[PDB]
């Protein structure tokens, strides 16, 4: 019955490519949940157990919609789509809100038990506090109290349909460009003086991983609206080997993808993996991950893809004097 | 009898350790009303009516709302919540202040002395009022009385963790820096500076005066602690330690947490400025790896030791 | 007919300690407003009526609240109590304050000659009107009132409605010490006007207003100058103490709901009179002081049956334990 | 039809004390005005007049917005008075001018006729002298638009006329253009203001255009003041003395009396505003008691002018 | 029917006089307008034609909206007027982008043949931006400048008369970028400053792009036509010429009061003079008839004199009463 | 099957003039956006492809009106025109861009297959990139990021059509960039640094614009992680321009010659005149539209006289063209 958060890592693992720390996350967080939809509560009466639902911080390319997505294609139960600045201005809050519970609803088929299991993605989420409007950015504590109870009721047309917030799992994701800052910043990294050269710390990860709260209240964020999602999940930074990785091995492979789009014109399309290798260089200069390296590949191709109706060509190998360096386009051979 | 302020305090602070200002205030203010009640509404010799109504102000991750809660839990009277933001929109005032009286009305079972005895708490008054605003005298004519049980005897809160106690006691304390000559021995950053709160202050956090005349109670809660935290998080029922190690429990691994550990623990939270609910966060914190692997592991007795307290995402030894 | 000025003040003066001033200035404005009322219009030639509109100067806590309103109710007339900041907006003020002049027609029963009767009271004009030259079209739009606006859009005829402004006035007594002086550096026998805040307040000249920062174009329809005057700690103990339902006089009833005599000592609330002029809280922080005096007495006042609990001194200035049991 | 200006001038001269050349040429604007509307807008080719709308230059105090009454009062059309110093945006804020609008066809009572024949009175202008000007955007769009049809006046206090005036003679360093050239000076030039100077001053030139007409009060003075407290319908010694007198005790306002205390409100630099209240200032101790003073007069005399402080002189 | 811009030229010469280049323009877009309508392309298959919506400058005062409001008389066609100042902040104010051709629709009747045949004319674009100021009015009109021939973004604004004037008083800043980037000499020496009636004439689009354009905003107004200074004999001519003289509208004025009021030649000169200084334009021209007239109608009550006269000691100084004719 | 991306590519442009590694780029979004609805997915249990949808970035004047209309005359395909300003209000407004949807599925007649084909065009997006309610205060900015992102079969009127099949012609008028690209170099702007004119810059650097410089811009880094496919035009040339001036059906001097025929003037043009109007029409940095700008400066006065003109055919020569101070050449 409940899925365990090492199959349900082990299988995003198939989907999502490295991001392991965000992927126990997450893992953690629904197993909790679904051990709280399967018990009576996975604590006794008069505790109230918390929400287990994260708040993600996510770079370009990486994922983040491959992930959400992803973990609906891997549990099968009801899932929900929105981001978080299409909610932002009073008069329409608490209606649009019973629209997304109508899509779990609708895709739990109007089950109890599936659309407590149901999965609620919000993208966009540091772009409600734009700054540091009384009846303008409306979010923080109604979503708040959503996430608290709408049971059987409209929240804080289908009135009725919708289904617990404490079991579903909310998952929110937005990029907080200011990582680099506030986080070194706090450490004193900024400054014309040093802080403590301590503050090196030689980790790169300890600037993404120690983040708090202070962070975005910087970004204009208010704490208490954080606290409701107990769960903060960094995602790991791009790098070329994952970048390989990701354009090879998961279901949407982009070479598998592109591959098979020449192999639509009956063309085979080589490649030399070092090439492979020096692209995910080139598109660790883009910074922006996974969407990006395929912008890269498609600067190559497009000449040979432009001319494939009608060329004769046998294959076309992309290849670090054709892809990283030189004018012509891709190799062609036998 | 009428519940004492006293026993109030007591279970409140089972519930939520520390702040006993707030408990001593709002169990005297609710006795008061209460025995009001319970003795008609206010009697005659020209016994002015009294309101008797609470504003919560402290820093955020207090359970101050879950306060109020908890003793609405403790002496099962009907509470209403809501939230001021909508209150500031036109229309939507008096339907809100519907949603407020029929969650009262209809967890009194109808009667009119639980009802008169309802408590009604009010929440985000910190997003609304800064110094206009659209509920000044809107919901004023509310707290003086109206039908749509009658609001002129209900007990109200307005609970919030507003962003002036950082500004207006720090213009007339925090300012007093320098003490070259020590004649404002009171510059204590925190500790003096909420005890010197006064309503025009919250004047200057923006709100009417009249509407301190709708709360004569203007209590201020005390500075959290990581002694009071670590309290909480073991001692009251509803305990995060507790809920954690029955998640793990229910695993089938049982979960300790060293007490050095906890204040090392309390004391991040407090650092990091996040309050109770960042309390379970720090704990997810360290126990996501446990969590994870859990499932299957061996482990039977996961010691958090104070280590992994001191660096916050460290995993514990294992023995088995 | 026109209720006699002296009779206004001597009335004024059983619910407002003092003020004998401000309560002249309200005694003449209230005369010439209800002979201008009463008298179909003054002169019959239909010249200009008598203005009577107030502008009054007093400090924080000063019972002008009470003035006003206690004005209103022995007259039997309305009053329309109004926050200036709570009201500004934008200059869209027009639709926040005519639901102040609907508080004066919904406290008049909608009649016409009872909201002339009634009086606007507009609260603190000098924290919104400072010098910032390090809102002049609002202004226009409340000098409208007094030029009078009638029952179309920016309604009972506003300069036949009573109106009241009222500020602490802070600066003013900088720049009558720069008449009364000759400016504020000061030396040799500058002290022949350089000597009280009284001596200051009571030759106060409206024009330092307008350098202050106020529109002279505004004050031109305000002839009436509500000066009140300096309250003291005997003047608060008298605000405990004479009021009918003075503040501890409802302490006293709260705890006779427990059948507790909360008695006060006089000497305690000297010591409070000092200590609230020395927080500078006005007469308003005086009930906090006594509720964080008798916040213990409630306290344990379910399981108490003590006889009298008095209020000490010693107890009044350290709070260091309840006030006395009388066992 | 309208009367003449001449008239207009004499009835306009009951109500406002002086300012004459700006009542001239209001009178002859609102009469070209409405005789153009009302004897068919140019039967000749249907072709264009000037809409003659007026910019006034005066003190503070100065009863411009008494004589915008006045006129409104005496020729039986609707108006509107308006301020444009918080109009001083751009964009959005020329609608609320419009809304201005919207005021006067809540005062024409929602007839188009009235609404062509209504007049727009603008205050305080040169606070937008500065160059958002949306205020002198504004008048532009609206001369053309029936819009166009509608009468307009607008006044400014302009302080910056001693520049002008201080340069509009002997202009520059040298010894020739010496104190022998371009005769006429400082204070002439506060009524034959040019539209150059207007420009100088620190106006729009097309907005300058959108004035056909330039006008200007009299600079307040004592007796002016003492005039404005006793000959109009609104003189302050009328119903001062009149609500004494329905007490029946009668004030004996005398004139040099009433000398110093026009030096007071002219000392004050307040002008006919500060008057209603320095006779407060002294009056006050007069209506304190008069229902119990049974005085058989008293009288303002030069020293309680001069103290504005005792109670004025009692008769027994 | 194709009205000939020649003829259209000289019946606006009726009511506003001078310009005379940009009037050429103008009825060149007449005639190009109607015949890119009434054959609705001149292109083989109706391949789209230029279509050449107009930009105007020069000196304020100069009667161009006179100017359009007497095109919309002499074709009797659909007009309206837009205005760049109003539509900045978009939704605040910036929405009624479309609500100009719904002003010009609904007074057109909602037809679709003569409101092609229709006018927008938009006035103050040299005042709302530099190159966010007011650049934001670029972006708001642009959309409805690329103009959608019938469908809703219906009449083709690429036949609609489409002109766009203003004042545009920075081109001597540019002439002086060009001629005074000469500036001190020593080598080349400000040999350009051979002239000065040229600077408006050599108006360039980047000039435009210095005054707060768009170059696509520009190029979608590819035809710029410039005006000419009003000059005395042009004042003369707008005093005395036309039909809306203004002589002879403060000589009817004061005739429904029985006054003629009599102008020497040498008083219309000297209002001439005066008004070239003042720089107003010819609506400034009544603005300095005004300051004579003050004393007439106003005694007119007082004196029965038949007619009046005015001298150049009533026009130069205008500090004197008119001779009477009793 | 679907059309090839050459024969779009040649004939858009026998209409559109220069551009040509632009059309190439279109052409071949148009044709993956083609095949992945005909061939209806290329790999096992039916993956789908990236978004693969097209940003145009370059100068105004390139045409862009002639090729979004030529792309529906050549491909028989539903179409739809946005703009990024039109719905940047908030709270109600900027959801309208689904109105440009709905309009693409007006082009379809409402046919899922063919708005699934449908193309539509966006122009202004430089517009809006701001890096108060400041950056991001337009919902449409975030609006097309969701439907960019993919709404495959859900709203937010009937069902919404996933964009990995819908093709976005996603355009600006890209002013304020070059000089911030080249200052990626260019910054040996006072300092000298790297042999500090050694460039060959202009189309190198514009031709190699990194998402990093539209962020410079002003853009969300992120939008362009919708926006793979970065399309860099041709610049201004003044060939190009006297080949709009002679290729296209539109051409100007058809234009202008059909319009002065109907006068009996045959306007004949000079192609060094036509050359010396296309470099002062690059001048004037414009592209084709201070084209017109020129040659109707030119002809004001003969225009104005045509009509009481008798002349047969006027020629226009360089001297009228370099100087305009000349009537063109009357032969009767």
């Given at each position: 019955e409940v899925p365990k958060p090492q199959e349900i890592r082990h299988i995003l693992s198939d989907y999502v490519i490295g991001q392991e720390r965000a992927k126990k996350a997450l893992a953690v967080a629904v197993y909790n949940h679904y051990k709280r939809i399967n018990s009576n509560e996975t604590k006794e009466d008069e505790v109230e157990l918390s929400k287990s639902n994260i708040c993600l911080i996510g770079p370009t390319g990486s994922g983040k919609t491959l992930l959400a997505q992803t973990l609906a294609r891997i549990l099968n139960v009801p899932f929900a789509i929105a981001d978080a600045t299409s909610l932002t201005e009073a008069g329409y809050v608490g209606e649009d809100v019973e629209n997304i519970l109508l899509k779990l609803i609708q895709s739990a088929?109007?089950?109890?038990?599936?659309?407590?299991?149901?999965?609620i993605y919000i993208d966009q989420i540091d772009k409600v506090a734009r700054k540091s409007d009384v009846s303008g950015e409306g979010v923080q504590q109604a979503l708040l109290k959503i996430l608290e109870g709408?049971?059987?009721?409209?929240?804080?047309?289908?009135?009725?349909?919708?289904?617990?917030?404490?079991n579903i799992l909310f998952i929110v994701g937005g990029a907080f460009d200011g990582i680099e800052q506030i986080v070194k910043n706090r450490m004193g990294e900024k400054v014309i003086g040093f802080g403590?050269?301590?503050?090196?710390?030689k980790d790169d990860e300890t600037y993404l991983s120690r983040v708090v709260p202070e962070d975005l209240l910087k970004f204009?964020?208010?704490?208490?609206?954080?606290?409701?999602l107990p769960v903060?999940?960094?995602?790991?930074?791009?790098?070329?080997?994952?970048?390989?990785?990701?354009?090879?091995?998961?279901?949407?492979?982009?070479?598998?993808?592109?591959?098979?789009?020449?192999?639509?014109?009956?063309?085979?399309?080589?490649?030399?993996?070092?090439?492979?290798?020096?692209?995910?260089?080139?598109?660790?200069?883009?910074?922006?991950?996974?969407?990006g390296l395929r912008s890269i590949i498609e600067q190559i191709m497009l000449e040979v893809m432009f001319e494939i109706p009608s060329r004769d060509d046998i294959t076309k190998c992309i290849?670090?004097?054709?892809?990283?360096?030189?004018?012509?386009?891709?190799?062609l051979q036998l």
């Open positions: 088929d109007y089950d109890v038990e599936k659309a407590e299991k149901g999965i709408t049971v059987a009721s409209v929240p804080p047309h289908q009135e009725l349909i919708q289904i617990d917030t404490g403590t050269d301590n503050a090196k710390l204009g964020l208010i704490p208490e609206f954080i606290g409701r903060i999940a960094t995602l790991e930074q791009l790098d070329e080997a994952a970048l390989v990785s990701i354009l090879t091995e998961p279901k949407n492979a982009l070479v598998k993808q592109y591959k098979r789009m020449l192999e639509l014109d009956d063309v085979e399309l080589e490649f030399e993996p070092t090439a492979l290798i020096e692209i995910a260089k080139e598109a660790i200069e883009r910074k922006t991950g996974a969407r290849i670090t004097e054709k892809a990283a360096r030189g004018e012509e386009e891709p190799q």
